[PDB]
Amino acid sequence: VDCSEYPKPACTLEYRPLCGSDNKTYANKCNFCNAVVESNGTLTLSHFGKC
């Protein structure tokens, strides 16, 4: 997914779960992309929905 507009200082509460390569279910794309940046690009997206 496109994380180009990240990191963002806040994420909304809109619950659109997606499963990281870490097996964490991120709450939405904002939370996921912020984690991608924090990971220095090690975290990828496995799939949409819960892990």
Swiss-Prot record:
Compartments, record wording: Secreted
Positions bearing the site annotation: Reactive bond 3 for chymotrypsin, elastase, proteases A and B, and subtilisin: L13, E14
Cystine crosslinks: C3-C33, C11-C30, C19-C51
Glycosylation sites: N40
Domain spans labelled Kazal-like: 1-51
Domain of life, per lineage: Eukaryota
Domain notes: Avian ovomucoid consists of three homologous, tandem Kazal family inhibitory domains.
Protein name listed in UniProt: Ovomucoid
Organism listed in the record: Meleagris gallopavo
Full-length numbering of the shown residues: 135 to 185 of 185
